[PDB]
Amino acid sequence: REFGNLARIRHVISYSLSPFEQRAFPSYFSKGIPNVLRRTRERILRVAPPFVVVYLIYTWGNQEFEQSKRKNPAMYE
């Protein structure tokens, strides 16, 4: 539960540098923008179309409310 024991790990080697020895923004744009595009490509199709149909039925409800408030000339006689 503490850092004394949580799991049994064997034959695992981890390397790290100092924060004062390595940069803080290593290729922030050049290797960061393709990462954002990759994540968007991975999770664009299972996220957006619900909000697309939200926009569609929101516009439909607004224009149908506007048409219902709009008068109907059924009075010619």
Partner: protein, 380 residues
Amino acid sequence: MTNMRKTHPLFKIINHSFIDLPAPSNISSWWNFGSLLGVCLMVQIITGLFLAMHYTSDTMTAFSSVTHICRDVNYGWLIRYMHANGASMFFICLFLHVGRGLYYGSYTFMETWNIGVLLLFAVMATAFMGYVLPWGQMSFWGATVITNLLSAIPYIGTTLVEWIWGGFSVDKATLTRFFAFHFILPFIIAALAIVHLLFLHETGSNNPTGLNSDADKIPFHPYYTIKDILGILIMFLILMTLVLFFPDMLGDPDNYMPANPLNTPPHIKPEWYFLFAYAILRSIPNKLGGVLALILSILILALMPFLHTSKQRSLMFRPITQILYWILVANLLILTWIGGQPVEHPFIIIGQLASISYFSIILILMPISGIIEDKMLKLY
């Protein structure tokens, strides 16, 4: 010599809870919202303490006291708008908190999840009573509306509403008792947040992958200390731009007039964070049925751990249930919009379809999607 950080009792409790807490290394920005909720809670404590420091809870003087705070008191307008937009950001953080809990399978901590559910009930009650506090027209009328929805209960509702009114309608006794309850109940919220964190520390913390994080765990300090500090700073960016640039876009213009019991508002609505519940209760055309629909629609969160029929915890590798979850989030947005909109064609049928689809997704479609997911991965 001894290590004071781990030998002093209060200090070793602090060290084991927040300094040397083994946290998962891969938790994303969605994990900052608990700390954001705590910091917003403290902000609400201090800011409302100053508001009640300059506030009088009487129907003759509530609105005049609010005007006195906003004008005469030095920057009490800034205090009031920080309080209101901090309540709004508190519900934003609560919604993203429960979104993380639903998406990443964090409801498996059943005790922690139930404590959070009752915390959500308490926060909703506090915010409703604090919206009753400024004694505006829509404030008083929303108080009457929600209390009559409480009165929908048979054989208990009328007497219990006469009991909670302190009288025969919403009056001075109701306003003063709502002031006392709104002052005091965030401290019960704070104690229950202590219980919340205690249960979470007992059960550990979850990761976005939904796996056992014990192979790769890092101390909370300084990693999540500086991550939560950055989260607090971005939270203050959103809160302060709402306070200092658009103070009334999440508010209500009709709250800026004194409460007239004779004059009814032309279009009544609660605040934006009550809109989905208000829309579903509008959708079911029954008093007892509507109030039961509201109560069970907040209690399905407590019902969530009994609806987990998948052998994978988080939704990171369950695309069909992700699709259903985002349809669900879309459905809550539709419910919020419909609760904003009045009772006219076709808002009734859109609200009924939205509520029916919301309950169907949360109770029927998601476990069948999980079973289909397990069958597609060939787990049996």
